[PDB]
Amino acid sequence: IQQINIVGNHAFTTDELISHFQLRRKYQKQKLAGDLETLRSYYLDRGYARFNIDSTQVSLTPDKKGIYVTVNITEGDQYKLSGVEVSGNLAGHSAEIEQLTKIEPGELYNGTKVTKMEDDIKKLLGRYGYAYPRVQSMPEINDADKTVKLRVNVDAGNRFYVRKIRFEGNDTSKDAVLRREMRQMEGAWLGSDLVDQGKERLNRLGFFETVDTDTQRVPGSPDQVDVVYKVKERNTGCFNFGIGYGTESGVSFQAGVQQDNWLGTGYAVGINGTKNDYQTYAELSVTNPYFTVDGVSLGGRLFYNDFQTNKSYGTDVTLGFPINEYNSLRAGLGYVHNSLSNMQPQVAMWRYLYSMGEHPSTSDQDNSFKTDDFTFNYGWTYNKLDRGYFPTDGSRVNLTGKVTIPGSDNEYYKVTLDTATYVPIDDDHKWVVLGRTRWGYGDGLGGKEMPFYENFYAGGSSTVRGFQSNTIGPKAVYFPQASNYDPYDYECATQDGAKDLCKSDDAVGGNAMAVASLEFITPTPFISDKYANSVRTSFFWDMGTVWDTNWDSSQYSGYPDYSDPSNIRMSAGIALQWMSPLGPLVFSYAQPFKKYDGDKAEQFQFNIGKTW
């Protein structure tokens, strides 16, 4: 392609029109047709009612050393719209047709606007049930006044009914699973808007790779349609366990299962746990997204743990239900056991315990504390995303919290908010931009402070990439009774190695947090379809902070003030998210730009995903 030459074009220069050409080289394979239609629309959308391409030529240089492309353009004048007259077999919807048809006098003629008008008429009729209308628009060009008059031949046809709804490709999921997401009922008229919502709904569940639809005419009658959906199920969940032996751990093992769709019945369940010489963990989670036909949900979980010191276990059950097509509410009850022993003296912990009414001796680790509290939890969600696992549009909001009730030992509240917004960058969704924020705050009631084991933590791929998990925030300050680990202990904890109160690197968590990031999601043209189809990468800037409320910076005058929320940490990097057939995997590389003492960094991170 040595050059493209436009012959006889005076309205615009070459660069202005060439900027819209894509064949800007060898082996173009006649792709030029795409550019010529684009040129026609450029003029046809600008009022040049008489624009016509008369001929094109492609010329080769000697020995195929280059290509010469020339186009012969005939230009006309600019035309304006004079009005639109619509007639035909219209089913009484004259006001809606007039409202969509009406144009502003003097508006430049635009072929695209005419096509858009036709599409709006077809969509309206489809909404009422006229599945196959015929609309034919034509211009009338009046050279006497440089105007175009429009006429549209509209044929609504007739009403269609859906005789049956069938599904194919549902080899594993129970048939009831797909019928629950249809809004079109059998034995009723075919409003076209209702079928598309069903198509969208089956992609909201996240159990399928793709959803196809059809509206096939019934061969036995001109007025009936059979609607057929085709799905391709993907692997949903995995099962893992393991065990090993050695002198550093004796014998330990882990196991658990999690699925979003249990044996194809629609239930979401999962069980996991682990046991070793120092820690015990178990979890059971079962929920039914459709307890009742209308989609009231129920679920809950049980857990047990200990550590060799503390011990805890508890239970919760949550009820929830929708309140419109895009919003739902949740609420539930639960119980948590909290028993502490052999607690290492800490300033934050002991201030909490003193407020609770405890009176441990200074630096005495030979202690314990246990309470049994009853609480209530609640939340609110919004979800208008158009995809299950790789959203391209919409937004999601998750506002949750819990409170204590009379009879409990602790008195506290906690509120968190999870939001994300997807906005397409490209017309064809090659590039996508992702915004993410998290916010949270909580504290005690009645003069008490929140238990230290409920504090917020950050770091790791779940919050701010590039920092070690649960490391962002204020660090523990240890008191200088007895310890047999002096020979194996913290300098600020041992009564012999230190004689005063001082800071260490152990994070204690905070009463408030803020996390935000911006990601630019890029296509991966350098990765073949086998892998590229399930992976996206993005460029990002991450920031956030954690700080302590009720921090006595006046008493601890020699240490940093943990109440200052302005010490914002920031980092940025590149992350990859791959929906592996064996479970989605994520990793990223990022570097810090702003850090404070103790902000240990982890520039490269890897973990199992399946989040968001």
Binding site: N235, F241, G242, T247, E248, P581
Partner: peptide, 18 residues
């Protein structure tokens, strides 16, 4: 099919996906 396992102190694990 679509599984991973092995044996390694001694350590072992297994994964199965649906």
């Amino acid at each position: 099919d679509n599984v991973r396992f092995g044996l390694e102190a001694v350590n072992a694990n297994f994964r199965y996906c649906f």
